[PDB]
Structures are given as C-alpha cells and as structure tokens.
C-alpha cells in the first residue's frame, strides 16, 4: 500500500552505493550502512578508520553480547576481518520494531571503506547460504522477520539523479526508498511482473532473452547465466559474462556507430563528455532482458536506457558519463545502474522478485524505461546453468 515513514530513506549513487539509517546497541548508535541484496551479513566499522567519522563502539552498548568468534571475509575487490556479536538494531524510518541481530565488529580491512561515501558499514540481504563464516550466522533479515510480525519481502527505489551530485549535494539529496516490509504504490508506475528467485543463496534469476534496440543477441540462453544472474544493489554496473558482454558492447558500438568513442570508455575506465545539455542519448540503444515468468512458458521483459547504462561523472560544465556495463567472470550481476530504472520488490515469502518502471528513473521526452509482458517463451529451464 502507502508505506509513507519508509519512503524516501535511502542517500547514495550507484558508483559509491545506497545506505539507511540504523542503530546499533543501548543507548542507540546511529550509522549508515549501505543496502546490499550480493551478501548476507550485517557488518560494521568498529575501530578507527581514515575513512570513517564514526564507527560501533560496543564497550558503550549494555547490550551488547560478545560471541567470541572471528570472521575473515576476502572478496575479489578487497577485505575486512571482524569480530561476531549481537546486539539491538533499529532502523529509524523503517519498521518501528528492535530486534537482536548478530553483527560483525570490524576492526581490520583493506579497501573496504570508500572516502567520502557516507556509509560505516553493510546490511547483508541475501540469504544464510552465503553468510559468513558459514550458514548458521543468521541474517539480519532472518532475524527481523522471526522476531516480529514483519512480512517476509521488501522492497527497493534507488534513485538516480542523472546527473553528479558534489559532497554536499548527495548528503541533501533524497537517494531512494527501502520499504521493509511491503510495496509502497507511489514507486513505480504500472504493473509488477514478477520473476522467480531460482534458489535462495544470492537473489539469483533466470535470463531468457537479450535484445539491443529490438535486436536479438540470439546466443544460447545459458550464456546469458553462467554462471549463475543476481540482482546486487552492491554492484554499480551491470555486468555480463565474457562472452555475452563481448557480443553486446559489439552490438551497443553498432548502433550508436554515428560517435566513435575510444576503447577505454568501451572498457568502463574512461569518462566521456558532451557539452552541457547536448548528450546524444538517441544515438544509444535500449536493453531489453527478458526474464523467465511465474507462469509456464511465459516471460517478461525490463528495458532500460542509456540514461541507466551511462553513469553520471564530474569531468568543466560539461556532461560527462562513464560506460557501466562491464564484464564478469562470476555470471551476470543487475546492478545498481540497471536497477534505478526500476522498483523491485524481493519477495521472499513468495520467493520472487518483483519489477516496475521505477517512478524515479531517468529519461527524456521520448522513451521511457518499460516492464512488459506476457511473452511465449518455450524450454526457460534450460537458460539455467548446473555445475
Ligand atoms: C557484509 O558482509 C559481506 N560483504 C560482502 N561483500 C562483497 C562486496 C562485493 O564485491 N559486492 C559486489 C557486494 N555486492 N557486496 C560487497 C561490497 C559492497 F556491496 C559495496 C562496497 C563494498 C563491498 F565490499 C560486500 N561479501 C561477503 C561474503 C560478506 F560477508
């Protein structure tokens, strides 16, 4: 329905990621902690940090428990190692209930915490399968639905500005909405199709069809999952496997063939810019992934816009972007620049995830993002990759 204390509680861009407001412990200590449905745990900065104003100090939480163990987590881009606990956790505009959450006390790590990002920690969403160190640390989310009468879903609006905002622009500036609980109707316009989540570990789904301008990619829908599709606020871009973004970006170049633009912005690592107002965006193609449906052979599509795919930089008054789909060697990951054209809504009871043209996306007066269906779609099954 109207989840009104919930709406508009997100801060954040793509590239540094989305937060909320929690508190941890008695008396409460307020953090922001970025929103991530790619992990599982409930992890905070709890020692002196360049990078943080402010970190969990449990000596001063009455509260807290001490479960006298570790937890060392090496990921591609980094590290943190902790130290396990609980403690009471709220989330301020949210749900106005306290529960007993377990919490990882960071005190070691490396290239974790972003300069300037606003946020001391991270609010795992995914499920227990893939929580550290193993499936027994219950997630927070686990945790909020056994102890109070929270319905097992929830729902995200992340919000791009379309373009930069400075320091003290993204601390003003509304980022999105995490409606825990619930759908909110005033996110998105139209109708929620709804995709099913194929096993409960990361959100993982099933990809059936790519489509660049209307035009088929016509690989062998398994490509376009191997080894496994996510949908991971975490990420900023969205990224492909090898052989599925070599094919696309082939595709992508084909269309927008009028501009030639260097290979360091094909590769994600170059800004490009256009003078203030002017960025062709006609010239850029749409994406369209088709997803598998809830009902047998039929899926829908999500299409999105460059105004999604090219991602907001400061150069100048120039408006500058950089290219934020990029390759994977770990399966397709919907990131945060794919989910700003939308509302998506994890629907855990129902183990599916929801999609609608987000009431926030970014466009122009002649196309819009879309959420479309029902198409036929025989043998979806197969787009799934084993081993
Ligand atoms: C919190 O706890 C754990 N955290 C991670 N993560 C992996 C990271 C990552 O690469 N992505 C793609 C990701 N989705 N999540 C990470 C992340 C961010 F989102 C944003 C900023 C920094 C990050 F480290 C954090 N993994 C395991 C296993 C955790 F226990």
Not at 152 to 177: I, K, T, W, Y
Not at 211 to 224: A, S, T
Not at 294 to 303: D, K, L, P
Not at 338 to 362: L, N, P, Q, T
């Amino acid at each position: 329905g109207s989840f009104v204390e919930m709406v508009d509680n997100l801060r954040g861009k793509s590239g540094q990621g989305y937060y909320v407001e929690m508190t941890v412990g008695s008396p409460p200590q307020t953090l922001n902690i970025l929103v991530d449905t790619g992990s599982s745990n409930f992890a905070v900065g709890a020692a002196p940090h360049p990078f943080l104003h402010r970190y969990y100090q449990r000596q001063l939480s009455s509260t807290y428990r001490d479960l006298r163990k570790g937890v060392y987590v090496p990921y591609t881009q980094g590290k943190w190692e902790g130290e396990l606990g609980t403690d009471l956790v709220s989330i301020p505009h949210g749900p106005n209930v306290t529960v007993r959450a377990n919490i990882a006390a960071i005190t070691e790590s490396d290239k974790f915490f972003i300069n300037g990002s606003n946020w001391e920690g991270i609010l795992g969403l995914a499920y227990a399968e893939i929580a550290r160190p193993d499936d027994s640390l219950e997630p927070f989310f686990d945790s909020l639905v056994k102890q109070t009468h929270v319905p097992n879903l929830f729902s995200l609006q992340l919000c791009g500005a379309g373009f930069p905002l400075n320091q003290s622009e993204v601390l003003a500036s509304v980022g999105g909405s995490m409606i825990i609980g619930g759908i909110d109707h005033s996110l998105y316009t139209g109708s929620l199709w709804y995709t099913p989540i194929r096993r409960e570990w990361y959100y993982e789904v099933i990809i059936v069809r790519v489509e660049i301008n209307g035009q088929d990619l016509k690989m062998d829908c398994k490509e376009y999952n191997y080894d496994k599709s996510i949908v991971d606020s975490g990420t900023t871009n969205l990224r492909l496997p090898k052989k599925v973004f070599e094919a696309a970006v082939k595709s992508i170049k084909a269309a927008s063939s009028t501009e030639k633009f260097p290979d360091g912005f094909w590769l994600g690592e170059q800004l490009v810019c256009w003078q203030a107002g002017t960025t062709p965006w006609n010239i850029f193609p749409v994406i369209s992934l088709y997803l598998m449906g809830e009902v047998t052979n039929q899926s829908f599509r999500i299409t999105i816009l460059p105004q999604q795919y090219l991602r907001p930089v400061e150069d100048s008054q120039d408006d500058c972007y950089k290219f934020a789909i990029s390759q994977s060697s770990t399966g397709t990951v919907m990131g945060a620049v794919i989910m700003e054209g939308f509302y998506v809504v994890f629907d855990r009871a129902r183990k599916r995830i929801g999609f609608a043209v987000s009431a926030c996306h970014v466009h122009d007066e002649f196309r819009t993002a879309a959420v479309e269906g029902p198409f036929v779609t025989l043998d979806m099954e197969d787009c799934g990759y084993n081993i």
